[PDB]
Each structure stands twice: as C-alpha cells, then as structure tokens.
Amino acid sequence: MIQRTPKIQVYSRHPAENGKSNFLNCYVSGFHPSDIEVDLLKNGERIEKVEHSDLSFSKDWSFYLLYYTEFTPTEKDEYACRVNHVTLSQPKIVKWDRDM
Amino acid sequence: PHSMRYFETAVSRPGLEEPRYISVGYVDNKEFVRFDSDAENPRYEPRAPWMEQEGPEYWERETQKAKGQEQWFRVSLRNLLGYYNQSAGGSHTLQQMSGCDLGSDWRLLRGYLQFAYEGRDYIALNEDLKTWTAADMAAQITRRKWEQSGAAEHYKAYLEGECVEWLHRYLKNGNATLLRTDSPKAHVTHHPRSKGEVTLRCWALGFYPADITLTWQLNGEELTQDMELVETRPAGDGTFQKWASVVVPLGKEQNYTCRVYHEGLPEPLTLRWEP
Amino acid sequence: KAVYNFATM
C-alpha cells in the first residue's frame, strides 16, 4: 500500500500570555491510513481532557485532525504533542513553542 | 467559480465485518453535511447553519443513499482484497471523491469521480466522462466491468445534472452568508536568534477561508531564500493561522516589511515590527 | 445531493 507519516504542529490558538487561559492545539495531517493516536503532554505526562475534530481528508487523499485542550501557559511549564502511527516506530513527541 | 464535493471513506475492520463508513459533503470547500456510520445513530446531518431548512424528506433520502454506499464499499472492499490477494485479517481503506466545479457563469467546468485504495490512486473518471484511467493491473479489472456495465453514463448523469442543480439550490439558500470571510489580523513578533542577528515572525490570524499569502520584503525586493514558514493551521474556532519568518541583522528590522494577501482584505496588508 | 455508486469494483 502507500502509507504516509503525520505532519505535526503544536501551537496555541492565541498568543501565549503567561496566566491567561487559552487552548493548546496539536494538528496532525498528511497521514495514511487513518488510525492514529494523539496525546497532549504537560511536563511529559498525559493531559486527560483532550478533544478532537472529526476526521477529514484532503484532495491528495491524506487525513487531517485537530486535537485540543484548554490550558494556561506559565513561563516554565512545558507542553508537547505525542503521536503514534504505523509509519512511526517510536512515538513522535513535538514540544510546544510560543514563538512558533 | 463555485464547487461541490463529497468525500467518502470506508475502513474495513478485522473481525467485526462492518467497515466504518464516513462521508462528508463540501460546498465551496465548506463542510455542509456529514454521515458517519460509527455514530450511535447514523444519518446525514447538517454541518453549517444554512442547511437546517431542508425538510425531513431530504435527510431520509440522503441517509438511504449513505446506507447504500456503505454496502457498495463493504462489497468493493472485498472484491479488492481478492484482486490484490491480501488477508481477511488486516485493515484496508478505500476512498472516493466526486462532485462538480462551476465557473462564475454557472456553466459546468468539470466533473470528478475517482477512488483511492490504501492511499494510492486506483481508478478515476476522465474529463470526457465516458472513460476511465486505471493504475494497477488490478484496477483494469474494475475498469472493464465498468466499461461493460456502462458505469460512466450513470456518473455523467449525476455530474451534469443533480450535482449542478443542487449545488445551485445550496448556493441560493446558501446566500445566507457562505459569503463569511474573516480577514487576517497580522503582527510581527521579534526573537533574537544568534549574536548579531534576530528572527522577525509575521503572523496572520483569525482568518477564513484558509488561502492566504505571506511575503517579506527588503526595501521592495521580495524574499524567497531565508524565508521560513508554516503550513496553514486551524486555530480551532473555524479560522486559520499562518506565519512566515526571516532572519535579519540586529537593528535593521524596521526596513523589512511583511505583506499579507487574502480575499476579504480591502487592500493587502503591510506591516513591520514595532513593539 | 450525493452521488450513489453503480457497479462495484
């Protein structure tokens, strides 16, 4: 078959402002097939209240999804998105960066 | 230029010999309906507010087609397994794209009807809408049967008729602003990168639809080398974000300008970095 | 309105 690896971005819905509640996003897309496992992390532990968009596919047939959760940025708290697919051997943890 | 599309997916499960079947209909790239078999109670549903007014007789009709397709995908999914010689014991994916593009004269530009299996193009109806293009030694089998059975004529009908006509209804009753465009709100953050250097990052936010262009300039000369960027991303409220960045020597940031291009902008934006 | 497929594969 022709499988494809998730592209992954991790980001806030608005500009991080330390101490204002916001939403943490991890957008995964360009993958195939559709089974995927996505978590958001605070300091390397899973966050439980994570929701996502319904499944979709782009014109090139590949799939995209958004996962998200409410959070509050602080200067030193560390956030990340972990991801598993049949294209990956190890889960891909991408860290969240304010400036990006 | 307007357009309609129904994006269908079915994924075959091991054991529980119903595949999950999902269908989503777009009008001018906007999700307006959906059917998801895995849902507790399956039914095409409205997915933008302007669809609610279609009576009940529309949703039943629509919903029966779905259960129809579910089956065709159930069976086609088997058929394929035989062609490729794969295991009843592993998950397989088949998708379909169909619909019409209209031009701003509301004339029919093109109709599409193609399929993918396992993420690879399998068979597509050509622009003539009487013939097929087939990749695999296997998808030629599907081709012959289709040529023999007169498959094309059927799809041509849908394409040049219902898909045109209904896309108009959805586009007059969808007068109720499918017009929505939220313009970008842009700004330039500043991020010291190395000794003697900084990154300027132009952000476009709270925009819809998702097409947008970003560029950076140095005294009129667009930048192409040294432009980093990202793929456009959903903010999660229905709108999109993107940014683009360049690296720039300390103290010269004010004579680099960022331009943002989006429909629903009155003019193209121009901005530079400033606290 | 969605298409409904004809012959299977």
- B160 and B265 together in one domain: no
| Domain definitions of chain A by residue range | 1-100
Q: Do A25 and B233 touch (CB under 8 A)?
A: yes
Q: Do C9 and B23 touch (CB under 8 A)?
A: no
- B43 and B120 together in one domain: yes
Candidate from A3, A61, A66 with C-beta closest to B116: A61
Q: Number of residue pairs across A and B with CB atoms under 8 Å?
A: 67
Written as six digits, the tokens of B242 are 């993107």
Q: Examine the fold and report which residue of B158, B180, B202 is the final residue of a domain before the chain moves on.
A: B180
- B163 and B255 together in one domain: no
- B266 and B221 together in one domain: yes
Structural domains counted in chain B: 2
- B91 and B227 together in one domain: no
- For B63-118, the three-class secondary structure string (H helix, E strand, C coil) is HHHHHHHHHHHHHHHHHHHHHHCCCCCCCEEEEEEEEEEECCCCCEEEEEEEEEEC
Q: Flag whether A touches B (3+ CB pairs, 8 A cutoff).
A: yes
Q: Note the resolution in Å, 1 decimal.
A: 2.7
E strand intervals along chain B: 2-12, 20-27, 30-36, 45-46, 92-102, 108-117, 120-125, 132-134, 185-194, 197-207, 213-218, 221-222, 228-229, 233-234, 240-249, 256-261, 269-271
- B54 and B90 together in one domain: yes
- B163 and B229 together in one domain: no
Burial of A75: CB neighbours in 10 Å, binned 0-12, 13-18, 19+: exposed
- B168 and B34 together in one domain: yes
Interface with chain A: mutation pick from B8, B118, B121, B187, highest number of A CBs within 10 Å: B118
Contacting residues for A12 by C-beta, under 8 A, at least 6 apart:
A22, A23, A24, A25, A73, A96, A98
Residues 52-81 of A with CB under 8 A from B: 53-57, 59, 61-62, 66, 68
Q: Is B156 on the interface with A (CB under 8 A)?
A: no
Nearest residue to B31 via CA among B54, B13, B49 = B49
Q: Which CATH architecture has domain A1-100?
A: Sandwich (2.60)
Q: Flag whether C touches A (3+ CB pairs, 8 A cutoff).
A: no
- B95 and B204 together in one domain: no
Which domain does B120 fall in, by range? 1-180
- From residue A76, alpha-carbon distances to A22, A43, A79, B188, B205 in Å are 16, 10, 10, 24, 25
Please tell me the experimental approach by which this structure was elucidated.
X-ray
Instruction: For chain A, give the number of residues.
Output: 100
- B134 and B258 together in one domain: no
Q: Examine the fold and report which residue of B150, B180, B210 is the final residue of a domain before the chain moves on.
A: B180
- B40 and B145 together in one domain: yes
The radius of gyration computed from the CA coordinates of chain A, to the nearest angstrom, equals 14
Positive/negative CA dihedral, B213, B214, B217, B222: negative
Q: Examine the fold and report which residue of B180, B199, B233 is the final residue of a domain before the chain moves on.
A: B180
- B173 and B106 together in one domain: yes
Q: Beta partners for B271?
A: B258
Nearest residue to A84 via CA among A39, A29, A25 = A39
